[PDB]
Amino acid sequence: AAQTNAPWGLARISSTSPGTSTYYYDESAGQGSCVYVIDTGIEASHPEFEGRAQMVKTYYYSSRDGNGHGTHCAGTVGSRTYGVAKKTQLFGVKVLDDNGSGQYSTIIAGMDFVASDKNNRNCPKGVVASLSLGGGYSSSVNSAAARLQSSGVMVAVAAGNNNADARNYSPASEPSVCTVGASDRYDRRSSFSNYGSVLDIFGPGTDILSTWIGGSTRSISGTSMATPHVAGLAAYLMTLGKTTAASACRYIADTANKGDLSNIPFGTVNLLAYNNYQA
Ligand SMILES: [Ca+2]
């Protein structure tokens, strides 16, 4: 399958070089997998989700995404136009309020919820979780992300937008999950993107067009935008039977575009998420 005039991030995921405009992907498109988007919620009614999205848990007064961030990330995971895995099932877990902030105990609770809630969903190809959030280092937040990964969920987390080493940020610094940095359309590390040895992979994170609340769309930047690319890719690769949840992190790093990124500090991996599609 080929999506012409796709967002640059999708085209980047399916190409060894930057500057392309077509997203090439296998028609399976992550069908049979599921991705928990743990953020501000998902506007499941957005036509781009085609009814494949739904809220499963909120830790606030409404399950409604009043911010737009969670809808944007869910769109990059699996919306029709802006999604990596265009047939994956999206589950929204609203651990962040409509101002985009959420207490650590709430984020931990949402991760524990996903670890249990997946046991009553039909996700034969596997389960992914996209955590486009984070703050300062927390051993308990890291432990919660590790538990979610240990429970059999491919956990992708944002490295953070501090232009610092991700070692001081959670859940970015938890080793067992896949920590995602951000790159721009010219194969540079995004100016804001965190780095460090804890990073596993880079994804398109600068000027990412995706869904927004109110049935609209908008382009925003952040490692929070790179994370759903990697999670959508994991759901895409798991549906293809190429990897499992416990190994998708290394498989994606195994098959990434190597050395293509600039301004990667020494000690940070130079790997760009890549689906290695050929047809
Ligand atoms: Ca890791």
HEC readout, the chain: CEECCCCHHHHHHCCCCCCCCCEECCCCCCCCEEEEEEECCCCCCCHHHCCCEEEEEECCCCCCCCCCHHHHHHHHHHCCCCCCCCCCEEEEEECCCCCCCCCHHHHHHHHHHHHHHHHHCCCCCEEEEEECCCEECCHHHHHHHHHHHHCCEEEEEECCCCCCEHHHEECCCCCCCEEEEEECCCCEECCCCCECCCCCEEEECCCEEEECCCCCEEEECCHHHHHHHHHHHHHHHHHCCCCCCCCHHHHHHHCCEECCCECCCCCCCCEECCCCCCC
* CA 71 – CA 225 distance, rounded (Å): 11
d(C-alpha 236, C-alpha 217), whole Å = 23
Residue 56's nearest CA partner among 28, 35, 27 is 35
Q: In the chain, which residue ranges form alpha helices assigned H by DSSP?
A: 8-13, 69-78, 104-117, 139-150, 223-239, 248-254
Record the tokens describing residue 112, joined without a space: 């524990």
Resolution limit in angstroms?
2.0
Tokens of 279: 């047809």
Q: Are 46 and 16 in contact (CB under 8 A)?
A: no
Residue 168: helix, strand or coil by DSSP? helix
Residue 243, annotated as binding a ligand: no
Tokens of residue 272, six digits: 């760009």
Question: What is the gyration radius of the CA atoms in the chain, in angstroms?
Answer: 16
Q: Which of 33, 39, 46, 173 is catalytic?
A: 39
> CB count, 10 Å around CB of 68?
22
Which range of residues forms the domain containing residue 82?
Answer: 1-279
Method for this entry: electron diffraction
Provide the CATH number for the domain around residue 148: 3.40.50.200
- Yes or no: say if 96 and 39 are a contact pair by the CB < 8 Å rule: yes
* Total structural domains within the chain: 1
175 annotated ligand-binding residue: yes
Query: Which of 33, 130, 224, 229 is the catalytic position?
Result: 224
Catalytic status, residue 65: no
Q: Is the peptide bond before 171 cis (omega within 30 degrees of 0)?
A: yes
Is 16 known to sit in a ligand binding site?
Answer: yes
Is the Cβ–Cβ distance between 159 and 179 less than 8 Å?
A: yes
Q: Let me know: does 91 contact 56? Beta carbons within 8 Å.
A: yes
Catalytic residue among 69, 132, 151, 190: 69
Q: Are 108 and 140 in contact (CB under 8 A)?
A: yes
How far apart are alpha carbons 212 and 71 in whole angstroms?
6
| Amino acid identity at 170 | S
- What whole-number distance in Å separates Cα of residue 136 and Cα of residue 50? 36
Contact present, 150 and 176 (Cβ < 8 Å): yes
**Four-point Cα dihedral 278, 188, 271, 169, nearest 10:** -130
Q: For residues 145 and 155, what is the distance between their CA atoms, to the nearest angstrom?
A: 7
Closest Cα partner for 107 from 85, 127, 88, 132?
Answer: 132
The two three-digit tokens of residue 231, written as one number: 């999670």
CA distance 128 to 36: 6
Any idea which residue has 């460090």 for tokens? Answer: 196
Q: Which two tokens stand for residue 100?
A: 């985009």
Residue type, 120: N
